[PDB]
Amino acid sequence: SGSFELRLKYFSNDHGRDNEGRCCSGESDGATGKCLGSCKTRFRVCLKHYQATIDTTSQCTYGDVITPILGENSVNLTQNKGFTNPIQFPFSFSWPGTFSLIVEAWHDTNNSGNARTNKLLIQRLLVQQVLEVSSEWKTNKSESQYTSLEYDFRVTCDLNYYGSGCAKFCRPRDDSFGHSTCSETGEIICLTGWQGDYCHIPKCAKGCEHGHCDKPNQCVCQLGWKGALCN
Ligand SMILES: *[C@@H]1O[C@H](CO[C@@H]2O[C@@H](C)[C@@H](O)[C@@H](O)[C@@H]2O)[C@@H](O[C@@H]2O[C@H](CO)[C@@H](O[C@@H]3O[C@H](CO[C@H]4O[C@H](CO)[C@@H](O)[C@H](O)[C@@H]4O)[C@@H](O)[C@H](O[C@H]4O[C@H](CO)[C@@H](O)[C@H](O)[C@@H]4O)[C@@H]3O)[C@H](O)[C@H]2NC(C)=O)[C@H](O)[C@H]1NC(C)=O
Numbered sequence: 001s002g003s004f005e006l007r008l009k010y011f012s013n014d015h016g017r018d019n020e021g022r023c024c025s026g027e028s029d030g031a032t033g034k035c036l037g038s039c040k041t042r043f044r045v046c047l048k049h050y051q052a053t054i055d056t057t058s059q060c061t062y063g064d065v066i067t068p069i070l071g072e073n074s075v076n077l078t079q080n081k082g083f084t085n086p087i088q089f090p091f092s093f094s095w096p097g098t099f100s101l102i103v104e105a106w107h108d109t110n111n112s113g114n115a116r117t118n119k120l121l122i123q124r125l126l127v128q129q130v131l132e133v134s135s136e137w138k139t140n141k142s143e144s145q146y147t148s149l150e151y152d153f154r155v156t157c158d159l160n161y162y163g164s165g166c167a168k169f170c171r172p173r174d175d176s177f178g179h180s181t182c183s184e185t186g187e188i189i190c191l192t193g194w195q196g197d198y199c200h201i202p203k204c205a206k207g208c209e210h211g212h213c214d215k216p217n218q219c220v221c222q223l224g225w226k227g228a229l230c231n
Pocket residue numbers: 067068069080081082083108110
């Protein structure tokens with residue numbers, strides 16, 4: 001029943017700097033001002049319900065996903081390393097139409113000779129708005145003092161799930177137990193020449209006494225009756 005997909009595209013940070021202005025590696029050079037060491041960037045994505053108080057201490061009701069080190073400084077996210085893009089937060093209820101989202105870009109060292117790593121928060125963004133179920137991506141781009149993160153987000157229903165909250169189930173069928181498709185809200189729209197609850201009954205031709213339907217618009221005659229309509 002539906003899923004919220006957040007697809008990260010590009011994180012920009014050519015200077016390898018921090019939320020507080022300093023550099024992630026912590027060492028520059030005397031002249032100029034550029035730094036040395038780059039910024040090993042991970043991400044944390046928290047999706048929660050719209051709770052109308054814009055607070056960050058509440059629980060991530062949908063998910064609290066942590067990303068491995070994807071790149072250094074500026075990163076082109078639009079691969080693997082165990083990470084899936086887009087990130088999917090599934091649900092089993094009606095989509096509430098509203099949501100709250102936290103996305104953090106983090107620095108994190110990764111030297112195999114250390115028993116403890118060094119982490120620095122690079123950027124934090126909050127997205128809390130009303131979102132409708134649609135196959136179109138909504139693209140945004142958050143820009144801080146040094147860093148920029150571009151992403152797409154949307155909610156789409158799972159397979160065989162129609163409706164506005166992705167709750168009404170419907171599967172097309174074309175066998176002895178039904179011949180039909182589904183509409184936009186999830187109603188069983190039947191193929192031409194079918195009828196009934198699941199539309200397992202064919203529709204014969206104009207007339208047909210004694211004759212019956214094995215397939216739509218046809219009539220099989222019984223003993224003692226000929227013609228087209230099996231009169
Ligand atoms: C911190 O560093 C860790 C080590 O990385 C090293 O450091 C730097 C210098 C890198 O440039 C790199 O070159 C170094 O190796 C790093 O650990 C790595 O973590 C990832 C995910 O957390 C692991 O990925 C998994 O890999 C296997 C297969 O990988 C093979 O190929 C690679 C190269 O292509 C080799 O390096 C490996 O040794 C293997 O030979 C995948 O199969 C697996 O996907 C599976 O996911 C689930 C299981 O969880 C299954 O259900 C799926 O079906 C898949 O089978 C992952 O993609 C990677 O192995 C690991 N490296 C090593 C050496 O163990 C870590 O990510 C860095 N960051 C953090 C935050 O820790």
